[PDB]
Amino acid sequence: GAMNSSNYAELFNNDIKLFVDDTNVYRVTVHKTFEGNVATKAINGCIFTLNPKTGHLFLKIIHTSVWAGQKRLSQLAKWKTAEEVSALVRSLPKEEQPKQIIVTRKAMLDPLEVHMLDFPNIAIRPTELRLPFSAAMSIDKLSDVVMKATEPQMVLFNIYDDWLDRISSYTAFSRLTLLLRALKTNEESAKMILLSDPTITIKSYHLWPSFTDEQWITIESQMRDLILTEYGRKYNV
């Protein structure tokens, strides 16, 4: 059934699973027309497909040409997401295919179920967690490859960098969700925290800075402060 706080360690067991987040697939800017009406202009998007145990991220870039001439784009975007996830599963060797796919938004359940009919043994599951994967486009290297794409493209990353050399998957996922929640609540401040010290750099082959264990503890505390604050600044507390 649904994934929630009670069954959280299941994410880090040895059954292959993928989270799919579709919140950045169909992206638009809303603007005025010369006649004073309103129109949208699409911009490139992406499917965020993540193995939470290994950190492997399959970032399928959705180029704006896929929307050309199509109607009801927000509905189509869910089906295009499911089409691309099904294609990714089929492209993987059998021993790498997931046993479960967890969708971050319940509206993806029927589209993904229908596209995965050929895979009756892959469970399609919702979740009660409010995961912050929409903030993926606040990771500069991810946003850069999406905006630069001139055609559909898949790009593979490890969203944990080399963290699993030192920490467990549970701890890595918690750090990731803390960083993304911060970036989602106050992107400017979060990015300030992460880059304030110019002596800590991001390796060419990494997404996040090369913090020592002690520096990660400081960083993580700064992100918690930010989230609680904004929660005050928001609700006034």
């Binding site: 189509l76 029927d110 589209p111 229908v114 009919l117």
Partner: protein, 300 residues
């Protein structure tokens, strides 16, 4: 006009014949039902006074044989049987008729209700849904499960309705996933009508039979089937005009006949709201929408 005699009535029972019903007391001198219209299927059904659990009954067509009812004290139910000796049966009915021990099928001449509820229902198709080939009539009860229900447990006692499943490879063409799921026309017209049922009359016959089993026996899997067959048409953007017009009539008479007090259990809110207000056919069921809005506005 045909007759279904009764050997006796040893236990107190409410007896239905189509949409009519009457109470018979224990050992009351009741010997059957006469004046049954020829040309239609019929159902004779039972609810015992001491155990309102298990409504049960028999679908039959008097053109196919001479049938009678007898109480079996071992299995504890009224059983339909066939009399092959035409003279022994004619003589028994005439004797019962002379003694005025039979109720008369109480049809009003103006009243087309039963025809309208069974227009496309044929005994030969009933006998394929309910498999018991040694009899010309078909037993159904409240508890019998459908083939589809069993998949999700005795096969000989199942209702073999045509399996309809909107999230199945049968319903969804590879490469037309979104198209086929949001517009079920290919599943309706190619898979079901052209492929399985052959024509709309057989589709409507199974839809009508499912409704009648839901209404008369409270058979839950039959209610599921009835709603699935409605939803499949309403969720198709391309349906022949004659089928939509006929569906509107079919459902109008079903909604008209339903007991007002059973609407809570026999009508699925989601299907009816989707069908009348969201689906492609939201504007094609004028008669059904009007009766539903005037009789069951709460559901909607």
């Amino acid at each position: 006009m045909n007759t279904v005699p009764f050997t006796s009535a040893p236990i107190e029972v409410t007896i239905g014949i189509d949409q009519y019903s009457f109470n018979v007391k224990e050992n009351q001198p009741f010997h059957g039902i006469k004046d049954i219209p020829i040309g239609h299927v019929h159902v004779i059904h039972f609810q015992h006074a001491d155990n309102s659990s298990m409504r049960y009954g028999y679908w039959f067509d008097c053109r196919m044989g001479n049938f009678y009812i007898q109480y079996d004290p071992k299995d504890g139910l009224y059983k339909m049987m066939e009399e092959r000796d035409g003279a022994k049966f004619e003589n028994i009915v005439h004797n019962f008729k002379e003694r005025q021990m039979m109720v008369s099928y109480p049809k009003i001449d103006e009243d087309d209700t039963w025809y309208n509820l069974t227009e496309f229902v044929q005994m030969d198709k009933i006998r394929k849904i309910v498999r018991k080939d040694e009899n010309q009539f078909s037993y159904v009860d409240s508890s019998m499960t459908t083939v589809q229900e069993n998949e999700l447990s005795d096969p000989a006692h199942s209702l073999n309705y045509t399996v309809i499943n909107f999230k199945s490879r049968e319903a969804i063409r590879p490469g037309h996933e979104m198209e086929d799921f949001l517009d079920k026309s290919y599943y309706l017209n190619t898979v079901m009508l052209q492929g399985i049922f052959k024509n709309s009359s057989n589709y409507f016959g199974e839809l009508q039979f499912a409704f009648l089993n839901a209404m008369f026996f409270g058979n839950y899997g039959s209610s599921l089937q009835w709603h699935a067959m409605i939803e499949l048409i309403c969720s198709s953007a391309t349906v022949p005009k004659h089928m939509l017009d006929k569906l509107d009539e079919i459902l109008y008479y079903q909604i008209k006949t339903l007991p007002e007090q059973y609407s809570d259990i026999l009508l699925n809110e989601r299907v009816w709201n989707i069908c009348l207000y969201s689906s492609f056919q939201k504007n094609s069921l004028h008669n059904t929408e009007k009766i539903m809005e005037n009789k069951y506005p709460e559901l909607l």
